[PDB]
Structure formats: C-alpha cells, structure tokens
Design a protein around this ligand. Structure first.
Ligand SMILES: Cc1cc2nc3c(=O)[nH]c(=O)nc-3n(C[C@H](O)[C@H](O)[C@H](O)COP(=O)(O)OP(=O)(O)OC[C@H]3O[C@@H](n4cnc5c(N)ncnc54)[C@H](O)[C@@H]3O)c2cc1C
Ligand SMILES: [Mn+2]
Length: 455
C-alpha cells in the first residue's frame, strides 16, 4: 500500500482510525480457526455508512482487496487476507435503532452483539434467539448465515433476518428489501435479502441488519440426560423430532465433550453421551412436553432428567465447548466440521464419526445442534505438526464427503471460508458453481470483495 493511498483512507475516516502497524494488522489477520494468520496491509475503522461507502469505492477503484471484519470469531478463515488489502473493522458502528417492539423487529449496526441486544431488550418481553457460542457481531452472524442451540425452535439467521443494509463493493448503498421496510412476508421482486445472508463478505459489506424478535417464553425448564451410547442418544433425538415435540434446545455432547466441559466449567455431569434439553411453554404445556420427551429417552436408555435459573451455567458451558475442547491440549488450535444431513441419516453418520475418531490418532470431541441434523467434530491440531494438520484436513474432508453422499450439506452454519471450497463444488455441481460465480461477478466484477473465499 502506497502512502498516497493510506493518506486517502485517512481523509475519509480520520487518522486514528487507519493503521498500518504490524501488530494491529496481525490481530486482524486471523479468526478463531487454525487457518494461518494472513495480515491485511491496513486496518480501517469507518465511523458511519458514508465512510464505509467511501472506503470501499477507494479500495475498489484502486484494485485493493477489501476484507470485512466483525468480531473475528469465525472458524473458517473468512477474515484471512490471502491477497492482502484493507481490513474494514466495522465495530465502531455500534448503535441499535428502529426498535419496534409492537412489530417484533429491531435494526442493529455491526458493533452490536447478541448479548448487547438482549441486554437492551431486558424488560421488553422480547429477545433475539439465534445464539452462536461466541459474543459475535449480529451483522457478522448475518454474513455467515449463523445458527445456534435455539435454531431448532426459533430458526437460523436466514429465518430471522428481515432486511439488510449493504455497501456494495464499488460503494453503492443497497437496502435489500427497501429502506426502512420490515414485514412478515413478501413476494415483491426477487428476494435479495436471502442472497446476502451467508455471503461471508464476498458480495458486499453489511452495515445494518433488521432482525426478527421473539416473545420471551412464559416458562423455561432445562435438563441433561445421559445415555449408554451415542446410538441411543441420537435415536432419541430423531424420535423426539419425528414425534414433533417442540423442544427449544436439543444439544448433543459425546463422552469426550462432556468430560471436556466438566473440566472447563465446573459442571459435573456423568461422563457419557448426553443431551442438553430445554423446553419453553406454559406450566401445563411444559408438563406435556416433558412427559412425551422422557418417555422417548427412557425407551432408549436415557437417565432420569437431571434438572436445571443460575443453574445459565449449563448453557454457558455448552457455549464454551469450543474452548473446553481446546483446553484438552493447551497450545493446540482447532478445526470444526459442520455437516448437516437428513435427520433419519444422523444416527449412521454420528456413530460412524465416533467410530472413526476412536480408530484414529486424532483427538476430537463431538458436539452438535442435532435437532437440525447438524453436528460438529472439533479436531485439535498442533500448530507446528504438519503431519497432524494433514490428517485433520483429510478427516474433515472425508466426513464432509460422507455427508454429501447422504444427501446433506458440508456446512450447516459456519460457512465455507477457506476450508470447504472443494466440498462446495462437489455439493452443488458445475451449474450450481457457475451460477454462484455469475452472482459474485455481477456484484464484484473486479473480484476485490474478500477474494479467495467461498468460490
Ligand atoms: C466459541 C465459538 C462458538 C461458536 N458457535 C457458533 C454457533 O453455534 N453457530 C455458528 O453459526 N457460528 C458459531 N461460531 C462462529 C462465529 O461465531 C460465527 O460464524 C459468527 O457469525 C461470526 O461473526 P463475526 O463477526 O465474529 O465474524 P468474522 O470472523 O469477523 O467474519 C466472518 C466472515 O464474515 C464476513 N463478515 C463479517 N462481518 C461482515 C459484515 N458486516 N458484512 C459482510 N461480511 C462480513 C468476514 O469477511 C468473514 O468472511 C462460534 C465461534 C466460536 C469461537
Ligand atoms: Mn454450532
């Protein structure tokens, strides 16, 4: 980057909000994944959407790649600057606006996290349910198409994003569903909002998201249930879904993950394949769901439910499973798989994955949003041992391909980033790939919007 270009950036955002210092760039060259740190040439913090537009147009017309950066909690290398360029950290735009409690909607800027939003909504009777374990940017969650433990009942980001404000790569401002609009359904034209959810910063910069809010549950009950085997836990899961019990959360932990979480969080659950469950409803609604769910789990060998206000501890431990797995081998990094399959095929692939981790020299813990047919294999890697890194990559690719063989997808929520680009080509085939590329090319003709990712 030339000093003329750096001074032009400073003219837009202000001298304090541009940095070419190596330490600042290195901090913005990686996320939480094992993908090697690739530092951008500069980091820029725009203060309002006009500045985002002017930064993008400056980069775009000068041939400088743009990397949108939220909270850097992604796990597929989305923020790695594989071709250099300007990292745009969006978190100084941190305001909540247009809170419309009577319409169940709110507008947030990229610096707002889910925790910040739900704190703002305390005593409103409303909450935002999509819950990645990390304290992530909500606009980042829109960009990756995130989900979480609550998705089985309340939907993913795709279900709960109503509208997006997007700075296109050349600086034009798009409101995907129209400026200020919010509604429950529309057939007006082509649905542009869904194109930008899950685009990972390769189609434009999300500068605000309009989110669907939900009523807080009348009553809540949480529980854990220990099983004799992985098969018994996943069969119970499938049978619960096929019986249409509207569970609020249904999370699976294998024995390795249960032990890891015990050690990391001062939980002390029996070390066994375990379901964490949560139910929402009225008093009698809960009782009926509990009875039907306990009957199914018992038939598969489940323990009596170990019940859980502050006992928040349960789900905080789950949300930190990524770090619990890391702590099994301090100094390691982690790679996660993220397949999602037709639910009737979930038992076969989860059991086969357990058998394959056991038969291998890798350390892996299994944790999953199994109510969606989705699970994570969290594989640890020595950042220095390459033989291991190649064994971890090969394991993840084989798992991905088995999921594709079953009619599923290689990622339910984390995205493609750098890691799953070949699997995506296998998943949608040549006409799917060319169609996605044609969309990328019309929005980003010069290929400068987070290059090297997804496609
Ligand atoms: C402990 C832990 C638990 C997690 N649990 C979950 C989980 O349950 N579910 C889940 O889905 N994910 C989960 N994640 C992954 C991560 O939190 C999500 O993918 C999240 O959506 C990333 O948001 P971010 O702003 O931190 O992303 P970043 O790493 O900053 O960016 C991710 C990608 O999105 C792009 N991007 C970011 N912000 C924008 C923007 N405003 N406009 C356009 N593009 C943008 C970036 O360029 C990059 O390609 C977890 C991560 C951790 C560390
Ligand atoms: Mn997850």
């Amino acid at each position: 980057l030339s000093q003329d270009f750096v001074e032009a950036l400073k003219a837009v955002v202000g001298s304090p909000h541009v940095s070419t210092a190596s330490a600042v760039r290195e901090q913005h060259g990686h996320d939480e994944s094992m993908h090697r740190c690739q530092p951008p040439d500069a980091v820029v913090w725009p203060q309002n959407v006009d500045q985002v537009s002017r930064v993008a147009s400056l980069c775009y017309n000068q041939g400088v790649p743009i990397i949108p950066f939220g909270t850097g909690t992604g796990v597929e290398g989305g923020v790695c600057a594989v071709q250099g360029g300007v990292c745009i950290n969006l978190t100084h735009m941190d305001q909540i606006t247009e809170l419309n409690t009577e319409d169940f909607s709110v507008v947030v800027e990229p610096g707002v996290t889910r925790k910040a939003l739900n704190t703002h909504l305390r005593d409103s009777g409303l909450w935002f349910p999509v819950d990645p374990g990390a304290d992530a940017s909500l606009c980042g969650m829109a960009a990756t198409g995130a989900s979480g433990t609550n998705a089985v009942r309340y939907g993913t980001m795709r279900d709960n994003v109503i509208n997006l404000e997007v700075v296109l790569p050349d600086g034009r401002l798009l409101h995907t569903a129209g400026r200020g609009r919010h509604y429950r359904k529309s057939a007006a034209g082509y649905n542009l909002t869904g194109l930008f959810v899950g685009s990972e910063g390769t189609l434009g910069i999300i500068t605000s998201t309009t989110l669907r809010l939900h009523p807080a549950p009348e009553a809540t009950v949480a529980a854990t249930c220990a099983f004799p085997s992985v098969q018994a836990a996943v069969d119970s899961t499938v049978q619960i879904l096929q019986a249409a019990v509207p569970v609020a959360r249904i999370e699976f932990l294998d024995d390795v993950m249960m032990d890891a979480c015990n050690r990391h969080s001062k939980l002390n659950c029996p070390v066994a394949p375990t379901l964490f469950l949560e139910f929402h409803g009225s008093q009698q609604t809960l009782a009926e769901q509990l009875q039907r769910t306990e009957a199914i789990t018992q038939d598969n060998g489940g323990s009596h439910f170990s019940w859980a206000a502050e006992k928040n501890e349960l789900w905080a431990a789950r949300h930190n499973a990524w770090y619990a797995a890391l702590a099994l081998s301090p100094g390691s990094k982690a790679y996660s798989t993220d397949v999602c399959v037709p639910i009737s095929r979930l038992p076969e692939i989860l059991v086969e994955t357990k058998e394959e981790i056991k038969a291998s020299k890798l350390t892996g813990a299994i944790v999953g949003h199994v109510g969606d047919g989705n699970f994570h294999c969290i594989l640890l890697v020595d950042p220095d041992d390459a033989e291991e890194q190649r064994r971890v990559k090969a394991f993840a690719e084989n798992l991905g391909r088995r999921a594709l063989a079953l009619g599923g997808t290689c990622t339910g929520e984390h995205g493609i980033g750098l890691g799953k680009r070949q699997l995506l080509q296998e998943e949608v085939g040549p006409v799917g790939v060319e169609t996605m590329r044609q969309l990328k090319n019309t929005l980003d003709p010069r290929g400068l919007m987070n290059p090297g990712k997804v496609l």
